[PDB]
Design a protein around this ligand. Structure first.
Ligand SMILES: *[C@@H]1O[C@H](CO)[C@@H](O)[C@H](O)[C@H]1NC(C)=O
Lengths: 48, 199, 48, 96, 48
């Protein structure tokens, strides 16, 4: 500080800048038929 | 063009498609059995040992479902965190401007707007961007009149035309010192610049 | 193990995605520390 | 792990079994440089991480914002500074 | 020897799956902690 003053860069001109941000709030709602997935059509598998 | 947000939306879709494909591929894993097809097992082998091979497939497929459910619970926890953050950004950047510095994107945040996006929200954060700068000698406070202290509000005290004036911190515009742009103190701090003839 | 299927490919994919989140997070922290920092070229560790 | 030492580190046994910790993409020395830059960004002009004012004035205005008159605050600047750097030394000595 | 090695592969793959599930949960806690640290840098260090 010279005297009691500091050196600062103060803006003399400006603009507005835009910035995107995607925030995920949702996901695909996956449903699995566990019985059809594990054992398909087959009664021998469903019993087990 | 290649964009970070558009890539983030496509990554949500691609990660889901990859997980669903991986779960489907788990139906073609043998898991130590003779085949991954229950029809091929039952069209080639009799019931007592067919039951052993089907047990190997049931163990593999139930293990794959348990692993997929564990991954899905973890992913939905991250989606709950993201949706809570998006509701907070709507409330505190779009409907109002909460006094939080880098909450609504980087820089000197002016205001934000929201648009719908696949599986989420797109926020447009608008910021005040300086273009050109001027180097200026500033004082962070003054000691005036009867040793009363003054500090600038959102700005600095500068010497313009050999007079003490004020400028805003984000745009250089010398304007007169007044009670509008000043915090008063009954005693000036040490190392505040001595300005006996101000006000 | 190869006859067992794509189990190791899934374990590698999950750990690589987790490690990519740790790398991405360390960049967001480093970006957050550095965001808006302006220093003078006249700064010196030995004297100030 | 490829040295001739008799003491086998358990980390070497883990790594030879395929379990290894990779370094982070930025070294802890780089992050220490970023925390140092963020710290010195509060001491000197333009004070880019201290609301654009000297650090002692930022401390004073923050203490006054709690309901402390500025009069005692700019009369006791040295005592406030020694209390601040004694709190710093108390944090430093608290790791021992 | 195939039967013995299959038992070891099943145990070791189950161990990896359990470790991966724990690591995903722990990295979620680290993402939450990193977001809090970035918020503390922004709202306690760079500003108040
Ligand atoms: C500010 O910048 C814009 C774009 O370069 C320019 O059109 C305008 O004339 C500038 N104004 C001043 C006061 O420098």
């Amino acid at each position: 500080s010279v005297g009691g003053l500091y050196e600062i860069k103060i803006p003399t001109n400006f603009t507005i800048v835009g910035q995107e941000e995607f925030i995920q709030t949702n996901s695909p709602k996956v449903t699995i038929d566990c019985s059809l997935f594990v054992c398909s059509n087959y009664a021998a598998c469903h019993d087990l | 063009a290649p964009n970070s947000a558009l890539a983030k939306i496509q990554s949500v879709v691609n990660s889901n498609a990859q997980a669903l494909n991986s779960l489907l591929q788990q139906l073609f894993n043998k898991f130590g059995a003779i085949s991954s097809s229950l029809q091929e097992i039952l069209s080639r082998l009799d019931p007592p040992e067919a039951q052993v091979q089907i047990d190997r497939l049931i163990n593999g497929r139930l293990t794959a479902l348990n692993a997929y459910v564990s991954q899905q619970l973890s992913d939905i926890s991250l989606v709950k965190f993201g949706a809570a953050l998006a509701m907070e950004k709507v409330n505190e950047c779009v409907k109002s401007q909460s006094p939080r510095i880098n909450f609504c994107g980087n820089g000197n945040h002016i205001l934000s707007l929201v648009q719908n996006a696949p599986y989420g929200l797109l926020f447009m954060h608008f910021s005040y961007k300086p273009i050109s700068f001027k180097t200026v000698l500033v004082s962070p406070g003054l000691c005036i009149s009867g040793d009363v202290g003054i500090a600038p509000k959102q700005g600095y005290f500068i010497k313009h035309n050999d007079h003490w004036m004020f400028t805003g911190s984000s745009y250089y515009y010398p304007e007169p010192i007044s009670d509008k742009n000043v915090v008063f103190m009954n005693t000036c701090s040490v190392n505040f610049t001595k300005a006996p003839l101000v006000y | 193990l190869s006859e067992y299927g794509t189990f190791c490919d899934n374990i590698n994919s999950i750990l690589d995605e987790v490690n990519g989140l740790l790398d991405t997070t360390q960049l967001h922290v480093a970006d957050t520390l550095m965001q808006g920092v302006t220093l003078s070229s006249n700064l010196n560790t030995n004297l100030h | 792990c490829t040295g001739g030492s008799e003491i086998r580190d358990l980390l070497c046994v883990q790594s030879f079994n395929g379990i290894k910790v990779l370094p982070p993409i930025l070294s802890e020395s780089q992050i220490s440089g970023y925390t140092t830059a963020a710290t010195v960004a509060a001491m000197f002009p333009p004070w880019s991480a201290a609301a654009g004012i000297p650090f002692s004035l930022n401390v004073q205005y923050r203490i006054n914002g709690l309901g402390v008159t500025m009069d005692v605050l700019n009369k006791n600047q040295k005592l406030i500074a020694t209390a601040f750097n004694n709190a710093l030394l108390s944090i430093q000595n608290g790791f021992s």
